[PDB]
Swiss-Prot record, chains A, B, C:
It is found in: Lipid droplet. There is a cross-link at K29 (Glycyl lysine isopeptide (Lys-Gly) (interchain with G-Cter in ubiquitin)). Phosphorylated by PKH1 and PKH2. Phosphorylation is inhibited by sphingolipid long chain bases (LCBs). This is Sphingolipid long chain base-responsive protein PIL1. Keywords: Isopeptide bond, Lipid droplet, Phosphoprotein, Ubl conjugation. Transmembrane segments: none annotated. GO terms for cellular component: cell periphery; cytoplasm; eisosome; eisosome filament; lipid droplet; mitochondrial outer membrane; mitochondrion; plasma membrane. It comes from Saccharomyces cerevisiae (strain ATCC 204508 / S288c). One of its GO terms (biological process) is protein localization to eisosome filament. Residues 1-19 have a biased composition (Polar residues).
């Protein structure tokens, strides 16, 4: 929390910063947002001023979650196609390079596969929140009607106390109060349960995806460790590379580890 | 690798699938790509048909990597603003909800902070690859000139063997061959080193980011475990919630764990 | 499996590739398919959109199998006529060539004979699959009627619960369910048996045909080993060739080996 504990907008030194200086900021960060034109802004603004006042914020949150989920699909597609392009480019080189590049592309290819399942779970969580939005939006009109009846009673009492509509209006008010007494309870009963369930599901999905990505990256580093390099003098010929079998075993082990992993067998143990 | 080992495009059953059935595919996946208009396609196509033939593919890969890095910035911004909106919405509710929601927003807020550093490291890796692209593009013209000289010699020998330009052309050819003999060696010397260094850096960054995200999610689940829920009957009043101190300790522990973590202290140990 | 384990569409090196470099791709592979006009496409498309939905795919598979079987007949006829043409051409040459060519044509002539029996067995397998297609297509309407009755009951219950048609419709539904309970079992009983029998028959036919072809080719090489060649200087006369008897013994042995071979005496023993 650099922003919270200091007025500075920079990054405070840490263990990672002390071990390795932070890299310079990315140069391809333009001033213009370019957030997919005005479609995002329209989807963001139109949803917050149409329906009932009680459920106005959750609709905006649902729309923003939809935009968040939409972006990751494009990211995953671009990464997969980048892996394909790297594999295509690696062909017209030396034997060892034409194999290590292909294996790295194959390994990189699974990030999009993981992201697809992550997106599906994200959509499930978004639907779970939409349910709460819907129920609260349906709940609001009862309290609206009760307030209207109370205001009508208050005005008609001031206008003239001799009107015969006092008794019927009072009975309607007590009926509306009796209805709202259970309406509020049934509204408050399910929010703390559905929110908890949705957030638990989201956190479990995040943990699983992160652990799978970390395992894939570790095995990719293990495979890349095999790529031998040494300076070559002009006129010399490098020895014939014979490492085809080891890479196959490495990727087979990667597949076995990815398939065998379960949620209960999580490697990361938070303190 | 479902695609590789089976002609089916579906997902083969696994341990996670057996434990929990896969969720249905996301409904908000339209047929139209909508990949930021035609700007992406133009950046993708114009770069592959302008420069030298040798370095045509790496320029396309660099552009695609730039698009990949650009997408994650928008994703992180949208996620951060979603967290802000959730924190804003959680205010007008019960005391426990008005605090758990704020703490969850605060915890979610750091994903964008991690993504910024990930993007910076991605840009560094992209520059490292661009260096190889540049050097190979500069290398190609020497072999181009050597091929041109060889073709000229071959044609002029056929035209008439009595020309006095045979000796000078042969000397130029041997000079170009002597130059290319060291040009090829100096081209091949640095590729296997720079590629290895860039990919090692990228994998280290991926591992660090994934482990930090997993730790944050685990501590978020630990904090959310405190949110007590129980059904309430109409007319009843829930007991006053007193859990302010525990959440502060939880987030302080999260900050301490995030700051203390180092690369050498990685929790995940690939087999 | 080059396609599965690598994004490349080329061929990975193997023992045969290392021993002998792969030949260049055939030059007479035009871009246009020329798959017998549009008759194949019409037979392929019309069959998949006419009958019941359940048995739509197996009809397409049967049609494609028919096309596959049809192609091999033309291939065998062309190969036989090629052998005849080679035998005709070999007449107007030296004595040894006018005999070796005839013997090779005679040996080549049996490939079409083997292909005819292979085609017959292929047709038998196709009929076996057509039986399954027919039975499943006949099975589907029972479940169709049950679904229709269920939908009618569901709609009529909503329309008005006081209708006297509830009891009769429920009895019809339970009758249809009792029928479908045995219909599904009788459908699933025979598929796993007929498919297994057909595929076993097809594999046995393939093994027999391949082994016979290999034996014929081996004996053809043995016969061709007799054709002596030596460079001849101008003005010299080659010695009179006397090898008529050996070729007759070779082809007699080929006939005896082809006739004696049985399925139980298969030379190839898979590990
Ligand atoms: C600076 C600038 O104006 O960028 C405008 C953007 C980016 O185009 P580019 O990086 O200059 O061109 C890349 C490639 N070399 C080319 O010449 O084409 O090109 C554009 O005009 C924006 C098109 C969509 C990109 C949205 C990101 C906006 C961030 C700024
Ligand atoms: C279906 C379809 O045509 O979507 C077109 C897209 C998405 O608009 P929407 O989801 O329908 O509207 C959301 C909100 N409820 C609204 O009414 O506004 O709206 C659009 O026209 C596309 C604008 C940019 C989104 C790019 C994603 C394309 C994927 C399809
Ligand atoms: C090239 C091309 O256009 O081939 C068109 C095909 C093949 O005719 P060809 O090989 O050129 O002629 C062979 C012979 N020397 C001749 O002159 O006649 O000739 C044709 O027009 C196609 C006729 C049927 C062949 C179907 C195979 C199509 C694959 C392409
Ligand atoms: O200043 P501009 O007009 O915006 O253009 C940028 C820069 O000037 C170079 O043309 C280019 O680097 P290279 O010459 O090395 O390709 C870079 O591409 P990049 O961002 O992908 O590195 C562009 O973004
Ligand atoms: O069919 P359309 O015209 O594309 O509109 C979709 C759907 O019909 C609803 O209007 C809406 O669900 P809700 O009524 O529950 O808001 C949904 O929003 P969503 O994708 O964000 O769920 C839209 O995508
Ligand atoms: O270019 P085209 O018009 O398609 O004709 C091809 C080629 O140019 C030659 O005419 C011929 O080789 P030959 O001169 O040696 O006969 C070849 O026959 P082939 O494919 O049977 O070898 C033809 O396919």
């Amino acid at each position: 929390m650099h922003r919270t504990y200091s007025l500075r907008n920079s990054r405070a030194p840490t263990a990672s910063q002390l071990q390795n200086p932070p890299p310079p900021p990315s140069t391809t960060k333009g001033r213009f947002f370019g957030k997919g034109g005005l479609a995002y802004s329209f989807r963001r603004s139109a949803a917050g001023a149409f329906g009932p006042e009680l459920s106005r914020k959750l609709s905006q949150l649902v729309k923003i979650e939809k935009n968040v989920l939409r972006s990751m699909e494009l990211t995953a597609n671009e990464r997969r196609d980048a892996a394909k392009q790297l594999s295509i480019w690696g062909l017209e080189n030396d034997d060892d390079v034409s194999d290590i590049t292909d294996k790295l592309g194959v390994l990189i290819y699974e990030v999009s596969e993981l992201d697809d399942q992550f997106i599906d779970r994200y959509d499930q969580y978004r639907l779970t929140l939409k349910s709460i939005r819907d129920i609260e939006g349906s709940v609001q009109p009862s309290r609206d009607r009760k307030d209207k009846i109370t205001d009508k009673i208050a005005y008609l009492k001031y206008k003239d106390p001799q009107s015969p509509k006092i008794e019927v209006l009072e009975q309607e008010l007590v009926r509306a109060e009796a209805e709202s007494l259970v309406a509020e309870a049934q509204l408050s009963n399910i929010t703390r349960s559905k929110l908890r369930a949705a957030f638990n599901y989201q956190f479990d999905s995040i943990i699983e995806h992160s652990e799978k990505i970390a395992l894939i990256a570790g095995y990719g580093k293990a495979l890349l460790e095999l790529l031998d390099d040494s300076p070559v003098t002009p006129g010399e010929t490098r020895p014939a590379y014979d490492g085809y079998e080891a890479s196959k075993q490495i990727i087979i082990d990667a597949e076995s580890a990815l398939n065998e992993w379960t949620l209960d067998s999580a490697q990361v143990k938070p303190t």
